[PDB]
Structure formats: C-alpha cells, structure tokens
Structure 1
C-alpha cells in the first residue's frame, strides 16, 4: 500500500506585496514539507509530480469570465493587481498568483489520477493558494480556483461522470464555494464542519447553517455542521464524525474521498480559535481511511500557525502511511453547544439518511 505526496516550491511565489507578513504566507507549504522531511515521512511516500492545470480543466467548475480575469493578473501592474484584488472579499494578487493556483489544482489532479489508476492508495497535497471559498464566477477568502471542487470533477472526467466523491471539509471556515458548486449535485457529497457563530464568522453567510441540505436532486447531499459559542476541540470533532460524518459517508459509499484539509481549527491558530490537536487530526484521517477502499486525498486549505499546520498535516500523512492512530483522551464530555449543533444536524438530515440516529 503506497501513499502519494505532491509538493512544489513554485507555489511559494504567490505573495502579498503590501503585507509580507499576511498569514496566508508562502512559508506555510515549505514549513509543512520540511516537517515531513524531518519526521522521515517524505521518504516513505511515492513522490507525485506537480503540474499546471489547463484552462479547460478550470472550466469544469469556473466561468470563462472568471478564468480570463485571473489569467490576466499575471501581466498586471501593481496598481491594477491591487484594484482587482479589492474587488473580491479578502483577496491579494501578485503576478505569480495565477500560476500558483494552476499548480495547486494540477497537483491535486495528478494525485487524484495516481489514486484512481492504482499507482497509490491515498495521497497528501501540500499546496497553495487554498481553494474552498472560490466560487464558479468569483474569488474569495485567499482562494482563486476551487481546487477541491475541481479535483472531484476531474476525477469524474477521468473515470465516469457519476463517480461518487465525498468531500470532507474540516477547515474551520465553511467552504461556501464548494457547497455552491455541488448544491444540486447528488454525485458529490459535501460535508463541512465549521465555526459559524450564528453567521457572524467568515464567510459570514447563513448559507453555512445546518438547514442548507442541498437543492433538487442534491437534497441531502450537503451536510453543514456549524459550531456556535464554544472553543471546539478533539472531543467535538470526534463526536461529529461518530454521529454524522461517518454514518452519512458510509451510506453514501463514496469511491473517492477528498479532504479539504484546512488546519486553522488547530490548537494555536489565531484565526480559528479552536483547539483540535495533531492526534485529533490523525484520528479523523484514520476514520476516513475506512471509506472508498482507502482512496483518500488530503488537500491543504487554510491553516495559519506554521508549527501547528506542520505538525497536524504530518500527523495526517503518518496515518495514511499506515501508522497506528495515537492515543487521545478519555471521557471529556463535549461542550454543551456542540451537542446542540450535532443534534440540529441530525434532525435536518434524518429524512435523507435512514441510518442516522
């Protein structure tokens, strides 16, 4: 059983030229990659080459008008990069941004193909800029193109259109772009856990609440798990996986699992304010590996504490390689509010998932 790994230093080139310390830092992926080297995990993995995604592949999810405006930033003067970025919600653009976003997407494509043709069982994608806030027609929250949403359609395009793909989004933020792209779609199951605070948390939309369950044929195939009033940690994430994520996923029987793996719910992240530990991420990964004959691709999204994301993603890779899941804790009743969120999700999805309890 082989674990794949994709990483390309050129993705570092994307940067914020008006705040060189912006938390979506080039060094996020180099610090994660370096930690993989030091922990002797990188040598255990099959190295998958990065590549540029093509514009045709971007068209699997994005409008040609959005593609063309982002492609055009590669030749913009600083003044126009600044105006263009300011047209979006929380976006900065450099001249290298388009190429880096193409590389993060093509990297994940090659990983998905490696998994789907049998070259590897599972894989990990150390990529940037992130993807999950990007919409069909717009960029948002440090994301230009929806890497995870593209990878699901890419996977379908190289197999069959109805390939069952589960996307688990454990980034602390709701993946509004991923929800919206597949909202009518019953071939892609989207499950997001996210800090919500009654809609007061980025992306600041009631679209992230538990009562958005999908539209049309897609009703039931959009599972939002919103967290309210509480510094959620391992016990809460493990409880959501037990009562919602794994039961629903198993009933869906995916053939591929994409993890939109933001690490901004990690202990130490100032944007997230949550406290999931590395061993917590390790346990979530291990539960996901019981699906889809192990076809699990972990994709870096958010995560802004360099040490935290490097330890946490390393933990996930260690699990993919087959290392034993590490010990966590005992008892530790959930935070009150987390039982409330979980129960609310259970009720809204009972009509769609008959194995829910």
Structure 2
C-alpha cells in the first residue's frame, strides 16, 4: 500500500504582488491532477493533512522564528511585503503560515502511517517547500524545514536514535537540512545539487563536497556538487551507483525521506539540468531497496508544471510497485561529473568502508 497526501488548502499560499512567481499554488494541483490522470490516485491510500503544532515546529526551529512567521497571519500587505523582503527569496501572504503548518503536518501523518505499517511508503504533494529553511530563519521559498521536522517527528514516535536517511535531489543544496543535522549521526543527509563553485543558489561553499559534518555528525553529511553546466540521467545514475546507494546501505536507515525537488528536471526554468521522469523513477526505485521499502517522497522545488507532474507521478508509480521505465542510452559522463564524484568518494571513504 502506497500513501498519498494532498490538500488544496496549501494552494492558499500565494504571491500578492507577482501572481506569476514560479512557486505557484498550481504546482501541487497539477501534480495531483497528473496522478488522477494516470489512474495512480485510486491505487494509493489517501492520507489526510493536518496542521503541525508549534511544539512540533520546535523540534527544529527557534521560538523566535516560529513566532515571527506565526505573526504574519494577521499582517497587512505593507507588513507582509516588508517582512518577506527581510529574508532571502521569500514572499508571504496571510495564509503562508497555515500552509507551511499543513505541509509539515501532512508529512508527519505520512511518516506515522509508514512507521506503524499502515502503508509501505508514501508521497507528499505539499507546498511551500522546506529544505532551505534554517533553525532561525526562512529562505528560498521555505518557511519551516518540512523534511527535517519529519525526521525529528519520526524519532519522537519510535526511538530517539532512529536512523533516518534524507536524500535531497532538488537541484539546489538544502542548506537548512544540512545545518540542522550537521552535528547529528542519527540523520544522514545526502544532497545532489548544482553548485558551480558556489555561484548557484543558495550561493554558499557550505554545499561543497568537503563539508562532511561536524562533531558526532562527521561523515553523516554527503554533498554531491555538480560543476560545469547541464547534468542529467547519466550523472545522477552514476552518483547513485557510486555514492548514494553504498553509503545508504552501510548506514542501514530505518526510514528514508526524499526531499524531492524536481527542478533538476528537463524543462525546468531555473535548474538548467535534464533529468528525465524515467530518471527520477529509477532513483526512486533504488531508494525503495532501503529501510525495508519505508520511503516518504516530499515535494520541494521544481517549477515546470508539466515536468514536475510527470516526474513525481513516475515516482509514485515506482512506490506502487510498477516496473521501472526504460532509460535512454546513457551518454558518457561529463568529465566534470566524474571529478565531482571522485572528490566525494575521496572525502567520504574515511567514514564509509563501502566506498573503498
């Protein structure tokens, strides 16, 4: 059984000044429509959405940050515009806080259904995204770090040391998710992202391969940074074969969370990459071999409505047990991609004997 959560109330979050801003309300409604259109929806068990509580938000976020975003619910447009412009790439409406609560709570229920065995796996069609949100601030269309919160929520209903793998294949680095767990060895963060030597958003060298985690978390933060332009299925398949899967198998996670941005997809207006829907299917299908299939796919970015609808639908098809579609002939890896993969291997072979 595959769970699915979608609540159109999360469309209420909108940009009052720029109705064509790429983080559109119809992102989640188009993904949902494509599931119904491919007759995938009726094959899933519907999981209800709910508001995350403030105590649940406190699992990852400061009390100050919670109260600021919470206060935006009663703000006038002038206060909303000014508050949004205080962050890096944030727009806010009076419904933003509620929708971020719904995004988190949707994933809490989905992780709860997985960990209790109600469903084998699940998909969360939610917005606003989360992986850029930090402990104490919002960033890059994200208010609260949904994936990070779900990992802590999972631990709170099982045991504190539950091994949670977070795979972040959104094209941008999840700076918030990395920082939140950087000193933690119970949550293994693996991110593939366009980096361009720090030039690509979020424009920090924190996303480079040499950031392996700190303290107890040393070795439990894996950055796979792409440099030198367009990447696609050949590069992502290789990164999974050489890095993501062997590290994940050695970590032996008890729950797998996918920060599933689809802005690395062919056709995305911001990513500039060419990962295909079949590619995302194969990536999903491989992660399903971990944690006894307990995988939760959480929507992050991705802004070509057609690309993200086909891509995420193909992921759900894999969760439902369908056989992987056929990849195109995988071209030779771009030379810069082999350099990136080798750099990560050298950085993490000390901590992961499966890489030696």
Question: Which TM-score tier does this pair reach, normalised by the shorter chain?
Answer: over 0.9
Instruction: For residues 156-184 of structure 1, give each alpha carbon's deviation from its aligned partner in whole angstroms, at most 9, with x where no partner exists.
Output: 00000000000000000000000000000
- Gaps of at least 5 residues in structure 1 are none
- CA distance in 2 between counterparts of 1:273 and 1:329 reads 19
Instruction: For residues 56-95 of structure 1, give each alpha carbon's deviation from its aligned partner in whole angstroms, at most 9, with x where no partner exists.
Output: 0000000000000000000000000011001100000000
- CA distance in 2 between counterparts of 1:157 and 1:298 reads 20
- CA distance in 2 between counterparts of 1:156 and 1:349 reads 26
TM-score (structure 2 length as normaliser): 1.00
TM-score (structure 1 length as normaliser): 0.99
Instruction: For residues 110-138 of structure 1, give each alpha carbon's deviation from its aligned partner in whole angstroms, at most 9, with x where no partner exists.
Output: 00000000000000000000000000000
- CA distance in 2 between counterparts of 1:192 and 1:139 reads 19
- CA distance in 1 between counterparts of 2:354 and 2:12 reads 47
Deviation of residue 270 (structure 1)? 1.2
Contact 1:172 1:272 in 2 (8 A): yes
1:230 is paired with a residue of what secondary structure?
coil
Residues matched between the structures, number: 356
Instruction: For residues 245-296 of structure 1, give each alpha carbon's deviation from its aligned partner in whole angstroms, at most 9, with x where no partner exists.
Output: 0000000000000000000000000100000000000000000000000000
Question: Could you list the runs of 4 or more consecutive aligned residues of structure 1 that deviate by over 2 angstroms after TM superposition?
Answer: none
Deviation of residue 330 (structure 1)? 3.3
RMSD: 0.5
- CA distance in 2 between counterparts of 1:108 and 1:23 reads 23
Instruction: For residues 292-319 of structure 1, give each alpha carbon's deviation from its aligned partner in whole angstroms, at most 9, with x where no partner exists.
Output: 0000000000000000000000000000
- CA distance in 1 between counterparts of 2:174 and 2:329 reads 31
Deviation of residue 329 (structure 1)? 2.7
1:355 is paired with a residue of what secondary structure?
helix
- CA distance in 1 between counterparts of 2:158 and 2:82 reads 40
- CA distance in 2 between counterparts of 1:92 and 1:12 reads 14
Deviation of residue 331 (structure 1)? 4.7
- CA distance in 2 between counterparts of 1:112 and 1:311 reads 24
- Gaps of at least 5 residues in structure 2 are none
Counterpart position of 2:76: 77
Counterpart mapping for 1:66-105 below 5 A? 66-105=65-104
Contact 1:230 1:335 in 2 (8 A): no
Contact 2:230 2:272 in 1 (8 A): yes
- CA distance in 2 between counterparts of 1:275 and 1:259 reads 19
Counterpart position of 1:250: 249
Contact 2:13 2:95 in 1 (8 A): yes
Contact 1:230 1:337 in 2 (8 A): no
